[PDB]
């Protein structure tokens, strides 16, 4: 008998979620999720978005998710190279700017912001729950 | 084969923890925990305190926990009748005042405060994990 999620994670649906312990740039945020056998948050449904908006509703912190694009002309992609489903959220923030390390997306107050990937935010990691 | 804790709870050691979805007075907070076969947070150990302090470090909100006293001459007690373990935390704020519904403790980041039990706050529920 194994638990769906490790201690100190939140079990929701098929996944486990964990908030970072600090504020880091997007690349370091990505590395920390990978070291927990996880990835940065990927929002694939409105149900995913509702859950995360409630989970962060207690916090005014910015939280990186796994969404990035090299520059404004490029499409938004998750870490796995899959595209952003367009119906889920509008991206605010630095949507017209170009940065050397690219543009990355965070959620704050339930809304989604584009910013320079080298700047530091909290992050959310997710991984598959053990439901065998 | 059952999970230690339901969806939307956090499993930590022998317990499950839930952050309330609503902000209510302490009595109504307690009834919402009871409806989930749970009770208001009890901090039993320095390990429990470390865990809760890290869990709420994202939030500036007060969270009600299971600590109260009917009036300032009474001791602070958890809902189970047990006293506050020495050298865990100091209770700050107006510990001296008398309120119609009594005085209750909330935890906020690195501190615990006394407050009028009728004021509305988010709360933390716990219950035993299935192990």
């Amino acid at each position: 008998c194994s638990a769906p999620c490790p201690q100190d994670w939140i079990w929701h649906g098929e996944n486990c979620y964990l908030f970072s312990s600090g504020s880091f740039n997007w690349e370091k945020s990505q590395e920390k999720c990978l070291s927990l056998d996880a990835k940065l948050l990927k929002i694939n449904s409105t149900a995913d978005l509702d859950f995360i908006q409630q989970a962060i509703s207690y916090s005014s912190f910015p939280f990186w998710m796994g969404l990035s694009r090299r520059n404004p002309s490029y499409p938004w992609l998750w870490e796995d190279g899959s595209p952003l489903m367009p119906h889920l959220f509008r991206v605010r923030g630095a949507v017209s700017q170009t940065y050397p390390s690219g543009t990355c997306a965070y959620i704050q107050r339930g809304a989604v912001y584009a910013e320079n990937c080298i700047l530091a935010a909290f992050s959310i990691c997710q991984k598959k729950a053990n439901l065998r | 084969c059952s999970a230690p804790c339901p969806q939307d709870w956090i499993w930590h050691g022998e317990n499950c923890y839930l952050f309330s979805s609503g902000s209510f007075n302490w009595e109504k907070s307690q009834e919402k925990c009871l409806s989930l076969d749970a009770k208001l947070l009890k901090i039993n150990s320095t390990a429990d305190l470390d865990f809760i302090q890290q869990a709420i470090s994202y939030s500036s909100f007060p969270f009600w926990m299971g600590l109260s006293r009917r009036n300032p001459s009474y001791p602070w007690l958890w809902e189970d009748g047990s006293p506050l373990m020495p050298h865990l935390f100091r209770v700050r704020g107006a510990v001296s005042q008398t309120y119609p519904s009594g005085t209750c403790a909330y935890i906020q980041r690195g501190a615990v405060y006394a407050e009028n039990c009728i004021l509305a706050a988010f709360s933390i529920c716990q219950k035993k994990a299935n192990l």
Partner: antibody
Amino acid sequence: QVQLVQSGAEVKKPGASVKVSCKVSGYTLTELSMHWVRQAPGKGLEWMGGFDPEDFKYHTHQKFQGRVTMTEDTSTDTAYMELSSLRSEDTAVYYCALVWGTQGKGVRGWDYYYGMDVWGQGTTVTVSS
Amino acid sequence: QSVVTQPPSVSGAPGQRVTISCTGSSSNIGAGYDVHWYQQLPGTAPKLLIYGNSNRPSGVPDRFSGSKSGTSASLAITGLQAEDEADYYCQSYDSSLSGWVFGGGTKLTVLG
């Protein structure tokens, strides 16, 4: 660690304009969120304008629009506030203030959390004829 | 309701505790924006006292604290001393105005 030094006191006639300077030392202004705040004598703080991470633009309070211009000189690390059509009610201490909470390392959206920790010394503008 | 309001005056004796309420709306404190508090001693520039509802910057002592609840936030000062006599401003951001808003200010008198 960052300091803001403002230009000296000014006396102006109704109808004139004033331009207050705010020089940043210790870090580069292009990475930093500048605000302007004023306080008339015996009255409260009034936010005039500043950087908004919502859309990455400078906003001014509706109450001023037309009359306030905020500019930055990336070469001297100097911010400017210019207030035109001056009235007696504009007699006030003008303050520049900056959000230094993440020391240029945090996403700009941290601005809403950290507030204005670094303040210029203020500039007295007297509007009298 | 794109304003935040504060009472104009609060009073306490040295060693006592007082609170100052910042009352906002669904467009500022209730929209997920945090409250900051600024302390202005007689004849000085304002200084940041509390940020993000409850955080103390370096050199602000433990006896200032703050909290947020719904559309309001509160400043608490225990152990009042004479050097705390000052004007206190709350501040939030309002997404209906797309700008920052100060409360009217609260004069704190330490009864002498």
